[PDB]
Structures are given as structure tokens and as C-alpha cells.
Amino acid sequence: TTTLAFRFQGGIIVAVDSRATAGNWVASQTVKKVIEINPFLLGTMAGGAADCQFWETWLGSQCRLHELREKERISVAAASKILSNLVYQYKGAGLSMGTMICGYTRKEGPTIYYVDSDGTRLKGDIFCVGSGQTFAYGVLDSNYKWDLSVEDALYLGKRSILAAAHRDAYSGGSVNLYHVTEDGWIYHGNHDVGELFWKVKEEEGSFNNVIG
Amino acid sequence: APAX
Amino acid sequence: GSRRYDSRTTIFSPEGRLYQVEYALESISHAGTAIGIMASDGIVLAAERKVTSTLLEQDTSTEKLYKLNDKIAVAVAGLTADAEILINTARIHAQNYLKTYNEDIPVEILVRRLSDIKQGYTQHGGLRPFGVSFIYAGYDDRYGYQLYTSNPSGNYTGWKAISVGANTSAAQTLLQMDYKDDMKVDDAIELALKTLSKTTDSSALTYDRLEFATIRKGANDGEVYQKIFKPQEIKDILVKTGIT
Amino acid sequence: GYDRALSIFSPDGHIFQVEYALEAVKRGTCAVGVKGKNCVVLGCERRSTLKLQDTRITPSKVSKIDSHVVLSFSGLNADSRILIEKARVEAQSHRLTLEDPVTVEYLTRYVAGVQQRYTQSGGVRPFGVSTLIAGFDPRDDEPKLYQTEPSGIYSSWSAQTIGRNSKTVREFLEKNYDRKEPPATVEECVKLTVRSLLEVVQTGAKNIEITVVKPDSDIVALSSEEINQYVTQIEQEKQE
Amino acid sequence: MTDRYSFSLTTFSPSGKLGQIDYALTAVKQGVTSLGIKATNGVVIATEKKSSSPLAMSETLSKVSLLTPDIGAVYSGMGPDYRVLVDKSRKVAHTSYKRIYGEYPPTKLLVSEVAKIMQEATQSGGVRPFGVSLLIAGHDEFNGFSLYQVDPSGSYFPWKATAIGKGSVAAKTFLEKRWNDELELEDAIHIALLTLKESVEGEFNGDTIELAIIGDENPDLLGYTGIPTDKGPRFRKLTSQEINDRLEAL
Amino acid sequence: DRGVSTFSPEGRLFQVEYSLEAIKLGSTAIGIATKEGVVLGVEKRATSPLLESDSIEKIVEIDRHIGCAMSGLTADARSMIEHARTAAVTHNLYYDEDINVESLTQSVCDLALRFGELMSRPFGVALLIAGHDADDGYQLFHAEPSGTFYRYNAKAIGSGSEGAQAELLNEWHSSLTLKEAELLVLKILKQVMEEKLDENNAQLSCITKQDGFKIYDNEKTAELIKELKEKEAAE
Amino acid sequence: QFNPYGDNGGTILGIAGEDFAVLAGDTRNITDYSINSRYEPKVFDCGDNIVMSANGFAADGDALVKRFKNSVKWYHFDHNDKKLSINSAARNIQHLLYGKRFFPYYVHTIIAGLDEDGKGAVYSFDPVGSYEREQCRAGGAAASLIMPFLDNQVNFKNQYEPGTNGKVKKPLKYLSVEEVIKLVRDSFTSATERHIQVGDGLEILIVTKDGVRKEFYELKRD
Amino acid sequence: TQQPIVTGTSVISMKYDNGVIIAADNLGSYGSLLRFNGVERLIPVGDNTVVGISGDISDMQHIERLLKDLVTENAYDNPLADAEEALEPSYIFEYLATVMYQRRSKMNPLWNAIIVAGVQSNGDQFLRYVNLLGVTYSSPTLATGFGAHMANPLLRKVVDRESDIPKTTVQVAEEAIVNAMRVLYYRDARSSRNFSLAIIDKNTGLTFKKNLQVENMKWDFAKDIKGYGTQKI
Amino acid sequence: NNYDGDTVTFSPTGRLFQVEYALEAIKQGSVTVGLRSNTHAVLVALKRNADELSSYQKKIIKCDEHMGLSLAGLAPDARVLSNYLRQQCNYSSLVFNRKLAVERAGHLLCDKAQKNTQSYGGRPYGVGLLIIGYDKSGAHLLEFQPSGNVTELYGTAIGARSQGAKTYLERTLDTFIKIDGNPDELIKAGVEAISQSLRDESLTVDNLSIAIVGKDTPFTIYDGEAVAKYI
Ligand SMILES: [Mg+2]
Ligand SMILES: [Mg+2]
């Protein structure tokens, strides 16, 4: 996997690939690694496919119960801490998760929490997570500015996943893109690397290592 | 179990 | 089933009283009077024994005054056996605190936990309450000298001077009359004994029908000493204040 | 375990053990809560058949549950300690998991839930306590005042009183409290609270406690003279 | 099935009495007289072996029991209740003391443990109080000789001398006349034998009287030699013969 | 005394029958089922004018497609609601769908007789459970502490119930619009209520397939109240 | 040391059309280099127009299928005879599998039927309950041989429009049931040629709005 | 977590036109020691089922007791116990299969491979296998251990598919089974010469033959084999 | 009187009054009828409503493909007992691959009910059940009472005024017992039996409830327009 999420001027960008592997066997190229918890909350998946999928849809149920009981949408901090306190109970049992809980609330503003299965929970503006995280970081970090336009931010996120999809053998398939604002999350499409790579190579003039 |  | 024989020890009367607590208090009202008086430089505990026989071994005896730790003691009015159960609990609780924090337990904290135990017997479990009221006398470096009482309800309150057991009505009136804030320990010793002397149901107060303790700073410099009086020491303090 | 169903229904549909717990509240010393425009005030009667009391160490009647919420009560004193401890633990646990202190409504709902649980569990009697819970939600300046009772029902009050002669002082507040214009300041609100207590209390001597709670964890207990001043000032406006 | 009696059977009445403790004391009142006297170099405890049938062999029924090598007990009230208390008392001397400190408990502390057991029968669910009062005579290095009375409530008191049961009121009066702080153990045995005749109806000999002492160490009763710091049990039951020897010089 | 689980000679459970008396003392709650939605309305019954009436919560969301109104010992309903919400959300987790209204109601009703010498007494509160699902459409259920539940086209519970039920008997027909049903709940409430009905001492709610369960604000309810007087005056 | 798992071989394959879906599997059952049976079915009609196969360790496969069939039974009992939709079955099966996360069912699970709009659906699961809907999935021993063939022939991967300079992809389109059965039969004969654990027989369950039909074909027995 | 001690080798079986045959030798081995020789490894249940067991004998004896208790339990409050509510082979199998899989799931298996052979009440032949892992399967021929390797290929020459069953008489099928038992005695180092055989026929019922022996063995050619390559005398 | 405080107390004439009071809730229950031939078994139940705005309480519950029951009395108690039956039928399938004998279902219910008539704190079940099914020995009808007594019958009825139907079935026996291979005729006879227990009311379309099980019919329930055929 490769997943990222970064904060900027215009909210949060979330971008992920769609590959699942069992060793070198490519098991799927069409995994939905972003889970839509509520209209203002997103979770990203990396690590064990089942672990991530199961506990992150379980997380959605817990967030729903919060708002029934408290007549109010759950904070990103509280939602992320439910997941991190859950996995911490299982510490040592061999759960494998690297997740980011991404969302907006009025009390918090746009917020990202990195949560993994060792029980680490970190608030931050930029994270990349998965086997391809370093590749994504390399592109993302060297073009990141707080002031990126929504247009540029979306592309950088998309381009960073592409970078990782290309170099990391265990990332690929397609890029899924989200933008999160004060009004909630907005989906910005599924982008097959099959066509996206060649489109980016041509239009951007990058990827000269590759036989054109 | 496959991974991501 | 067995429901037939259940007295229901933890219910309310139609007036909203706890029968068993009330009846336990009634039991305590026939117990030997115990008095606590708090001075600026120490505390007195004085208590009257339930009417002696001449053949009772009076020096190796303890019925009223118990040591909880080095800085805290209690005076008992009620069932002795019930009180010992609670006393060992309190002693252990003091040691847990010391072990945990490396500091002697603050007096109130000890008093609260004992009172919380009593409270439990009035709300759940279907058991009879403990037929005991305590006067707690102790020192800690937050509040200094403190007197408290607890009773079978598990309610506790703090005092400058207080009595428990028999004739507390007469005793409380007398303490109220003669007590004053700037009092020294040796004055409080006298007040305690004079109060028992007048409220006693016996003909006259003698050394062999008493237990007595002080908690002073009267060791050496900024540290505290418990003195549980020997019989001969009470006999002397009874002469020294002219009751015999 | 001791199992007996002590709180049960009677033929008329009443739960006598809950209703008798209310009688224990009725016998308790009076407590009143009044919320201003920007503060909440908690006033408590202390029965004056007691001198030789040590007030330094005697359990005060208003308890901080967290640094922004206070709870007072009328009824059995020993019972109230149990509810306060549970409430205090929950306050810390809420901070630990939600990373936010409790709302006053949440904390009230919790205490209320505990009280209700004790009305349909075997081997236990209900709490002989009703509570007034007051404070300000985190990052909020709108004052909150709630009341709970042995049955478990809870609700919000512009002002409310519980304990003995509470009907006399509820009577007072009902004609003296304007929903439209709540005591616009601390000074104003403390006064109305003391007035209502003077309907029932005796001397305003060592008989009245007042605790004021303002927003952002600003809680302070008034001491004798500060209260005494209020008492003095009302009787001097009384001869008219 | 199982014990659904988890509530107290002893509760306060409106006057404040605990009925079952009072009634247990009444059962002790009915009981045969027993007594204890404390001398300067010993303690004596004695009672009447009032037999149920003369076909019964009353040596097989011991009313005076060894608890530790330096502690003994006698009772008045219900015999079966006493028997299980002795069983429990012996065991608690080991589990809560000897197995911890490698030595036997001092008298007051063993007494304290028995009292705890009896207090629990006064408050725990589904039980009645014990229908007995005990007299426990004992010796330990730092307290010397001591005598305690334990009642159904769990209360205990130290005595110079006392008596319990049937003719206790009379016997306590007798003991006030005779007791002084200079009694040598033989004098205490003698007084105990005089006091006990007042309350015994029928035969009065070493086969109807049970009597034990806490006195000197008995190396001959130890069972082994070679550890010079182990000197033997201070508890000794007087034989049928030993008692009759003291009844001729009565 | 006598066991909590005892039968009367008529073959009824004393404790269940006595809890039904407690429910008669409760404030009135009314529900009406239409083909356009289900309305739920209740009498708030503030015990004193100082008590802030919006804090009285006798209508409650269970899930987006299910709502609840209560009458009787309302504190007893907290755990029933909690169970209902968990049951609904859990079902969606296990099956990726909305839980049926009847299944929800049956789940809540399973709690009811779990008392004895489990809880110490039956619940002292009746529930009106209203929702929508794709199979059986709009539904209204009356859930009692006996563990029994009945589907209704319309139903009243609480003190004013026998009067209000007779009224609902006359007024309900299979073609009521939602707006007709809202007015009708308001009308029947004003009839059986002690004090004079206004937007502060009564509350309305509905559940529609399209927008799910909504509690009406006081501004919206006040206008339906005004619309109701003008309908009655005008003939 | 006792090893609680075994491997019974075989392979399965699910394809979904516009108004139908198929779930096929070979009927051979093996351990090591021995044949246990040449006809032991592992694709099952589970009711409510759902077919299911759980291929790998047969004992685990049978246990799971049994549990799901039972789950369908109770779904009727508890929810007024309501039809269990394929999406709801899938989610239920995730919980069945993940419930044994720390002692897994060693199976690759596939279910097939119709979604709520009457369109053909195939869902596949990893051994601990990760799942996903697809047009297409092979599972079990020969999965790695068959799956890339299906990417090419069902989803037209790496196939372009002739003379468009590799710029216009072959356009996606649903297959007829006749075409799908051809791909299934060829998939299995190819798999039989090159995988020793695949052979003997092929059983196909086809699911349409009129129910579940079966077709059987002989496969090479070596 | 177990290891088998006293063990039984192959159990072999097949369907024929009217019923099923099943056989197994009477040996209980103890490693390479052929320790016990009078061991019956075919256990009949009613008059319609035989359960043949290989693997750990202590676990086999446990299973015997379960089956004999099952018969008892089925008779309880059952007036049709010897008629419509008699135990079927499919009931007995599923019960065993359930137990085997539960025991493997508790990491404490019954160290056996089991073949349940019989005839259902409607006359259908029942032949199904289950082992320590709870793995189950049906085939016209079934065998365990070396039997799977050496008997199956021989028995499948007779019944190679479903349609071959009607064409197979009980004489033909018993011949194949008895021949297969000889081969196993030639080639399995933990087989014995003595064995039992049972036929469950839908007409004649259960025939249980004890104390069979492998006969007509070819050993004569052994005399012509000298040395291991170049040696002559 | 002094002996009806709980189930664990016998009266001086050897009666169990709590069990008898449980039996009484059955008597207040709406009527339901069971009857069978050799090929099928039928349940008919009169459903009762709260008022004209309410549903008509279901009285028939499916237990398996070959078994099910009707209830009279406390409905939650039928839910508990029917759920137990579902499990027992289920256990028989998963473990033995065997459809549970209706007779065993009977014995299992008897033993479940009995436990609640001998132990303190519990209470007897307050519902009567009529169990029908088709198994390896044909069609069956059982009558369950919460005393624990279960009885196999050709036909019967329980609830208020069930004595009308039970008399009718007693005369009709020789006829209905031999309605083989004809579902609709057996049902007709059942509907007529229940009609002998009606007073001031007759069978409407959302009032009648029928179930049938037999040789080649899974236990199925008919309500609403599906029963109009029979009125
Ligand atoms: Mg790659
Ligand atoms: Mg092959």
C-alpha cells in the first residue's frame, strides 16, 4: 500500500492507491482503501486488508452511536482515539494497521490523526503510510506548500501516489482522491495508473527513466 | 491474509 | 424460599429513615461514654469502661481506645467485636497508603474510607450494620490536630470537642459550656475527666473504670507522640485534677 | 450475592422504596441553585442545632466534580459521597477517551443513570439523595443547572431548590425569578439566592453556604463575612 | 439448591438489642459451670464433666482442650459449637501465625482470632451466633500468663479470675473473696476446686472434674531431646489421680 | 411479601399489572401512522414553570429510520433506548442494511420480562416505536412491560389515553395525509391535557422515508398549533 | 507436532453477467499426491438465490458453509422471512470469517447471486474476511493460472482497439451466459493441464431471477 | 497435541450394486513392534452400519464407547427405535464428523481415520470418510493409510465412477477387497495376515466375517533371486 | 391460598397453585385448533386484537421446515419456548443430519417447563402450545401445557371456549382423520372446528390464521388474503 493525507490552506487532501498483495501475487487492483465514516470523516487503510476493513467499519458504527447519544457529531480526536484505544487492547496479538483519521469539525478545524496497530496516535499536517510511503514522501515533501491551490493540492496528492505506484512493487492499480472541507468530504474520482502514468509522463515531461 |  | 426470613436490613421507613441504622444508634446510646477534645497543642481521648468487676485484669486491657497508626487513634462506643473488624481494616488501609505514596495517610482520608465501608452496609448486601461509633483523634501536616466521629450510617463530621455513647446530651452541653478555642492539652485533659465525672451513671469516677490517651507534639521538635495511659498514670491524673 | 428485589411495584403502580427515598431528601437540609446571565450560584442551608463543629475539616456541601462543574445535594450525606466519587471518576475517564471535559448535561445524565440503576437492581436500595449539578460546558459561557432525584429523572432548571421547606423557597423563586431577565450579574444572582434561603433558614449566620461558578473553571466559595454582608443588606431593605 | 441465605439472621431490634446474641448468652447461662484462675506462676481452668448417661465414657469427651502447647481452652454452653471452634482455633494458630513467624501466637492474638470467627457468626449471612462462652488460659514469652473470656458477640476480656455458665454469679463472688495477686499456682488449683464444689450436685471427684493448667515447661512431655531451646508444653491436663490427691487435703 | 415473578389467581403477573398502573399515571403520548409518514407527539408536563421545558426529552431517535416516544416512569426508558440504538447499529454492521422496525421492537420487548430473583422489576414505561422500512412501510408499535407489542394505525398512551383512543378511533382513516395527522395529534393532545396546549408543553415529531426521523422545533409546532385553531374556528 | 490444517486442493471461479452470475468449481478433492474423491462438490445453493464456495482446507470450508446456511435460516426467523440480499450475505460472512481472526478458516471464499437491482454479483473473501465485489474472481490452487486469463477475457485488460495506436481501450461489456460458460470451461481445462490438484470434473451453478441451475462437465482424470 | 501409540493400519472399502463392503486387519502395532493380534477395528452399529477405524487404538476404543452410548440414547423414549427412528449410517457419520472437527478445533484430536459404511433405510449405499482433521469425503471406493495408495487404484479398476456401481456384484467386489488385502500384506510393514470383513447389503443385511486370512500368495520366484547384482550362487 | 406464594410449595391436597394459575392464562387466551390426517397436520388460530386500530397478534410460529406450533396465553413465553425448539431442531440437523422427531420435541418441551415448576425464584410458563409436524413416522399433533404435560392427539383445541371445538372434533374424528392427500379439505374441517368456539364474532380475513405441514408441504403459514379462500 501507499496512502497519504495532508493539511493545507484549503482543507485536507486524501489520496490512496488500490493494490492488495499476498507476497508477490497481486490479489486485487481495485481495493477501496478510503472508508467514508460520515460526511465529515474519512479513514485510510494500510496493512492487513481484513484488519483495516473490519475495524474501520466497526469504527463507523461507534461514531454513529456517539451522535445518537450525544446529539452531536464525534470529534476527529475522539474518533481516532476510539480506534487507537481499540488496537492498543489487541497489542501483541498481531493486528497490522496503519491508518489516518481525517476530518473537519467546527471545534477542531481540519484535522488528521495517524493511528497504527502498535498503538501510536499522532496529530499532524502530513503523513504517508504503507510500503510505498517513502516514495510518496519524496515527491510530496519537495513540492508541498501550505498555500497550494485546491487544484494543485489535488494534483500533488495524485502525483505522489503515482510516484509510489511506479517505484513500489506493492503499490498500484489506481489512485482514489478526496478533498475535505468545512462542508465535508468531496470525492475527486478513481484514476487508473494504466492511463494516468502515460498522461502524466506526456503532459509533465517527467519519468524519463522510462522507455517512452 | 493479504495486505495493502 | 428463604425470602420468608429476610429482615431487609437496608430499606427505608415511610419517613425515609434507615431502621437498622436508627436501632444501631439506639444500641450505641447505652455504651460507655467516650469523649474527644481538641486543643491547639494536642488532643485528648477519654472513655468510660462498661461497668467493671473487681476481678477484671485492667492493665492488660483495651476496650475503648485503639491505635490505628503512629499519628491516629480511635475511641470506640458500641460493640467491641464489630469495632475490631473495622480497626484492622483501617490499620491495613493506612499501610496501603504509606506503601503507595511513602507518606503517612491524611486523617480525613482514613476516616472517609471507614465511613464509606459503613455506608455500604446500609445500602447493599442485606447484612446488619456495624453497631459502632468512633471518635478519631489524629495529626497530619495538612490540618494538624483533628477530631472526627463516624456512626453506623457512615456519616462523619469534624469536631473541636465531642462525645459518643451514653449521655452525650448532658456531656455535649457541658463541653459547650467550658470549651474554649485557645485551650491547652492539660486543660482539655481536665475538661474531659470533669465531664465524665458529672455524666457517669456510676457513683464516682475511679482509675479502674477509665481509658485515656493523648496525642501531643510533646515529644521532641515538630513530631508527634501517642500516649495511651497506664492505670497508674490515670490514677495520678485523677488526683492531679482533684476528682479523687 | 444478596439478590432481593427491594424496589418493586405496589398495586397502585408506585415504587415505595423510591418514594421513601424522596422522603429522605425532604428531611435533608435545603439546597438551592439559581443561574444568572453568566454564572450559576449554589446555596445550601446548614442546620444549626450544632455548635462545637469544626468547619475547616467538616465536609462542605458543594462538591467539585471536575474543575468546571459542581454538585450539591439534599438527603442522606453518606449516600451522596458514593455518587460524587463515581461522578468524579467518570469526569476523568471522559477526558481520557474523548480528550474533552464533560458537558454538564452529560455528567448529570451519568449521575442520573447511576441513581436509576439502583431502582431496578437486586440487593440494593435507591439513593436517598437529589442533586443540583451546575457549571459551564468546555469553551461555552451559557450557564447550566440540572436537578436529579432518586428515581433517575433529571432536567434543566432556570432555578431550583430541594430539601426541607423547598416548596416555600420554590414558591419564592417562582414569583421572584424572571425567565426574560435573569440576575444579570454575580452580585445580583448571589443576592436572589440568599433571599430565597432566608425565607426558610433562621439567621443568615453560620447557616448559609454560597458557591459561585463562572465560566472557564472559575469556581469560588464565599466565606462568612462575604455572605453575612448579603444578609445584612437585605434586612435593611426589608423595613419598608 | 445452594445457600440462598445471604442476609443476616442477627439484626438490631428497636430497643437496640441483638436478639440472637442475647439468646446465645441465655444458652450459655444454661450451660455447666466452668472457671479460670490466674496465679503468679500459672493459670488453672476447670469444669464439671457432667455425663449424659453413665454408660458414656466421659474421658472420650474432653471439655478442656489444648490449642497450642502454651494455650488451653474451656467453655460453657453448647458442646458441639465449642468442638468446631477448637478445630478452627487450632488451625488459625498455624495458618495465620506459625506458618508466617515460625512460632506459636501469643495468647491475646489467638484469642483475637477466635473472637473474629465468633463475631463473623454474628453478622455473616445465613448463620446463627455460637452458643458458647470460652475461657482461654495461656502463656507467651513477652506477656507471661493470661486468662481471657470470649462471648458469643465476639467480645473478649482479660480476667484475674472468673466463671461462666450455671452458677457463675455465686462462683464469681466466691472468687472475689479468695483471689489475691500473690497466689502460687497450687493455691489457685485449690481455690478452683473449692469454687467448683458449690455448683456441682452429684459426685465430686477426679472422674467428674476436668481441670488443666498453664504452668512450667514440661520437657518430659516434649517427645524428643537435642534442641536445648525447645523446652516443652506449658499446658498440662491434670490426671484423674492428681485431682483426687488434692481433694483429700481440701 | 411474595415473589416478584408470581402469578395472580386470574393468571396474570402481579408486577407486570402494577407497572401498567404506573404507566396510566404517565404524561400522554400519541402516534399516528399514515402512508406519507408516522407522527409522534407527547405532553411534556413540566412540574413547575421554572423547569426549562426543552430539557424534557420524551421523544427520542433510535436510528435514522426509527423514532420513539415514551410514557410512565421515563427514567426506566434510558436503557431500553440504549439497547434499541445498539441493536439497530449492530444490525447494520452485521448486515450492511437497515434493521426492520418490527425486529427492533421485538428486540426491545425481549428485555421486558428479564426480571426476577437480570433486573429486579419490570419497566414502568410504555413505548411508542415508529419507523419505516422497505418491506412493511410506515409502522407504529406499542411496546409494553409485559413483553407484548402491537402494531397500530394510531395509538395513545398515558393518563389521557382512554379518552384519546376513542377519539383516534373516530378520526383515523387509511388516507390521512401527514399534515392532517400532525394536526390531529395536536388536537387530541389539547383535549386530554390539563393545562392549555402550546409549543412549550407539547412536542411533535415524524419519520418519513425521505428525511428520516426529525423532532420538530417549537417555531414549526407553534405554527401547526395556530393552523389548528383556525381550522376549528372556521366551522 | 499436530498441524490442525490441511490442503484439499481444487479451484473455484466466479463470473457475473448483467442478469446472471455463475460460481464454478472442480469436483476433485486431494491430500498430498493422493485423490480422495473425483466428485465431491464444493459449490452450494445456500437459499435466497445465493451460491457459495469456500475453497482450501475442506473441513474449514464445510464448517463455514454450514454456518452461513444456518445464518440464512435465522435471518428468516428473526426478520419476518425477509430475503437476505447478496450485499448483506457478504457482510455477514465477513463477521463469520473475522470472528476466527486468530485461528482462521483456511479458505478462499466466493459467493455469487443477484444484487437488489437484479444485476449479477460476485463477492470474494480472503481467509480472515476482507471482501470486495467484482465481475470476476478465481480462487484456490489454480487461481494464479486462471485469474490473469479472466482479467484479459472478462475485463478486456491490455486489449486495445486495432489501429487506434494503443490509445483507445477495448470497450467494457457484459457477456452472455453462453460466452461465460465457454470461458469457465476453457479456464478449467487449461488449469487441469498445468495443475496437478485440478481435474476430474467441473460443476457450474448458474444464478438468475428464476433460481439456481446446475451444469456438469468431465475433466481430465490424470 | 497428541502422538499415536498403539495403531491400526489401513481400512479399505467400496460400494457395489446392492450395498457396501469394508475390511481391516486385526493388528494393533506399537511402533515397529506388532504388539497385539486380536484387535477388531470394524465396529457394527445396529444392523445397517459398520464403522472402520485406523490410527490410535485408545482413541478407537473411546469412539466405540461413544457409538454404543449413542445407540442407548436413541432408544430412550423412542417406540420406533428399531424401525423408522433407528440410527441411520448418515446420522452416525455426521455425529462422528462433528466430534472429529471439534476435537481438532480444540487442538486435541482423536488420532484416527474413519470410514462409515452402511445402507440407508431407503436402500441407498452410504460410504463416507472422516479423519483427525475433520476432513470428510465420499467416493465409490475409500481407503485409509497405505490402503489409499495401494487399494484404491485396484478397487477403482472395478468401480471407477458412479455408473460402475450397478454393474458390480458382491462376488466381484469382495474379490477386489480380498485381493487388495493381500497386496497390503505384501507391501505394508505394519499389516497382518488376519483381518475382518463386513458386507452391508440392502437385502441380506449385515454379514460380519471374522478371522479371514490372506491366501494364494506368490513367493516362489524368491528362490531365483540371488545377490543384489553380480553375485551368481 | 396460603400455598400459592410460589411454585416450590405443594398445597395440603397435593396441588401446585402457581402452575394452576399459569394454566389460567391459557384459558383467557384466544382459541386455537389443531387436527391432522395421515398425510397432513393443520393449525387454525383465531387472532385477537387490542382494538380496531391495532394488529391481530400472531399465534403461529415456524420451528423448522417440518415443524411449528400455535400459542394460547402469554406470547413472550411462546417466543422463548419456540426459540428453544428452533435450536433443538437445528442441533439435530447440524450434528446428526437428522430432522427432529415431533415426539422428541414434545419430550424436550415437557422437561424444559418442568424445571420451572420445582425450583425457587423461577415461575411456570404461562402459555399452551399446539405442535404439528411431519417426520419419519408421519403427521403429528401435540398439546403442550406449562404443567409440563405433553400429549399426542388426532385433534384438539385450547384457549377460551375451546370446549366447543374439542367436542366437535371428538364427533368428527372418523371423518377428518381420513382426509388424506387433500390439504384444503383438512383445513376446511379445522376452520369449522374453530367456529364452534366463536361467540358474537365470526372469522374475518385479518382475524384467521392457518398453518399446514405434511408429506410434500413444508410448514407454511397463511394470513390475510391467503385465507379468504376459507371464510
Ligand atoms: Mg508498483
Ligand atoms: Mg490436472
From Swiss-Prot, chain C:
It is found in: Cytoplasm; Nucleus. Pfam families: Proteasome (PF00227), Proteasome_A_N (PF10584). One of its GO terms (cellular component) is proteasome storage granule. GO terms for biological process: proteasomal ubiquitin-independent protein catabolic process; proteasome core complex assembly; proteasome-mediated ubiquitin-dependent protein catabolic process. The keyword Nucleus applies. The proteasome degrades poly-ubiquitinated proteins in the cytoplasm and in the nucleus. It is essential for the regulated turnover of proteins and for the removal of misfolded proteins. The proteasome is a multicatalytic proteinase complex that is characterized by its ability to cleave peptides with Arg, Phe, Tyr, Leu, and Glu adjacent to the leaving group at neutral or slightly basic pH. It has an ATP-dependent proteolytic activity. Belongs to the peptidase T1A family. Gene3D superfamilies: Glutamine Phosphoribosylpyrophosphate, subunit 1, domain 1. There is a cross-link at K99, K198, K230 (Glycyl lysine isopeptide (Lys-Gly) (interchain with G-Cter in ubiquitin)). This is Proteasome subunit alpha type-3. The 26S proteasome consists of a 20S proteasome core and two 19S regulatory subunits. The 20S proteasome core is composed of 28 subunits that are arranged in four stacked rings, resulting in a barrel-shaped structure. The two end rings are each formed by seven alpha subunits, and the two central rings are each formed by seven beta subunits. The catalytic chamber with the active sites is on the inside of the barrel.
UniProtKB/Swiss-Prot annotation, chain E:
InterPro entries: Ntn_hydrolases_N, Proteasome_alpha, Proteasome_alpha-type, Proteasome_asu_N, Proteasome_sua/b. There is a cross-link at K108 (Glycyl lysine isopeptide (Lys-Gly) (interchain with G-Cter in ubiquitin)). The keyword Nucleotide-binding does not apply. Keywords: Cytoplasm, Isopeptide bond, Nucleus, Proteasome, Ubl conjugation. Pfam families: Proteasome (PF00227), Proteasome_A_N (PF10584). CDD domains: proteasome_alpha_type_2 (cd03750). GO terms for biological process: proteasomal ubiquitin-independent protein catabolic process; proteasome-mediated ubiquitin-dependent protein catabolic process. It comes from the Eukaryota. It is found in: Cytoplasm; Nucleus. Its main location: cytoplasm. SUPFAM superfamilies: N-terminal nucleophile aminohydrolases (Ntn hydrolases). GO terms for cellular component: nucleus; proteasome complex; proteasome core complex, alpha-subunit complex; proteasome storage granule. Present with 7060 molecules/cell in log phase SD medium. The 26S proteasome consists of a 20S proteasome core and two 19S regulatory subunits. The 20S proteasome core is composed of 28 subunits that are arranged in four stacked rings, resulting in a barrel-shaped structure. The two end rings are each formed by seven alpha subunits, and the two central rings are each formed by seven beta subunits. The catalytic chamber with the active sites is on the inside of the barrel. Belongs to the peptidase T1A family. This is Proteasome subunit alpha type-2. It comes from Saccharomyces cerevisiae (strain ATCC 204508 / S288c) (Baker's yeast).
UniProtKB/Swiss-Prot annotation, chain G:
It is found in: Cytoplasm; Nucleus. Keywords: Cytoplasm, Nucleus, Proteasome. GO terms for cellular component: cytosol; nucleus; proteasome complex; proteasome core complex, beta-subunit complex. The keyword Cytoplasm applies. Pfam families: Proteasome. InterPro entries: Ntn_hydrolases_N, Proteasome_bsu_CS, Proteasome_sua/b, Proteasome_suB-type. One of its GO terms (biological process) is proteasomal ubiquitin-independent protein catabolic process. It comes from the Eukaryota. Belongs to the peptidase T1B family. The 26S proteasome consists of a 20S proteasome core and two 19S regulatory subunits. The 20S proteasome core is composed of 28 subunits that are arranged in four stacked rings, resulting in a barrel-shaped structure. The two end rings are each formed by seven alpha subunits, and the two central rings are each formed by seven beta subunits. The catalytic chamber with the active sites is on the inside of the barrel. Non-catalytic component of the proteasome which degrades poly-ubiquitinated proteins in the cytoplasm and in the nucleus. It is essential for the regulated turnover of proteins and for the removal of misfolded proteins. The proteasome is a multicatalytic proteinase complex that is characterized by its ability to cleave peptides with Arg, Phe, Tyr, Leu, and Glu adjacent to the leaving group at neutral or slightly basic pH. It has an ATP-dependent proteolytic activity. This is Proteasome subunit beta type-6. The gene is PRE7.
Curated annotation (Swiss-Prot), chain H:
The keyword NADP does not apply. Keywords: Cytoplasm, Nucleus, Proteasome. It is found in: Cytoplasm; Nucleus. PROSITE patterns: PROTEASOME_BETA_1 (PS00854), PROTEASOME_BETA_2 (PS51476). SUPFAM superfamilies: N-terminal nucleophile aminohydrolases (Ntn hydrolases). It comes from the Eukaryota. CDD domains: proteasome_beta_type_4. Gene3D superfamilies: Glutamine Phosphoribosylpyrophosphate, subunit 1, domain 1 (3.60.20.10). GO terms for cellular component: cytosol; nucleus; proteasome complex; proteasome core complex, beta-subunit complex; proteasome storage granule. GO terms for biological process: proteasomal ubiquitin-independent protein catabolic process; proteasome assembly; proteasome-mediated ubiquitin-dependent protein catabolic process. Coiled coil: none annotated. Non-catalytic component of the proteasome which degrades poly-ubiquitinated proteins in the cytoplasm and in the nucleus. It is essential for the regulated turnover of proteins and for the removal of misfolded proteins. The proteasome is a multicatalytic proteinase complex that is characterized by its ability to cleave peptides with Arg, Phe, Tyr, Leu, and Glu adjacent to the leaving group at neutral or slightly basic pH. It has an ATP-dependent proteolytic activity. PRE3 and PRE4 are necessary for the peptidyl-glutamyl-peptide-hydrolyzing activity. Belongs to the peptidase T1B family. Present with 16900 molecules/cell in log phase SD medium. This is Proteasome subunit beta type-7.
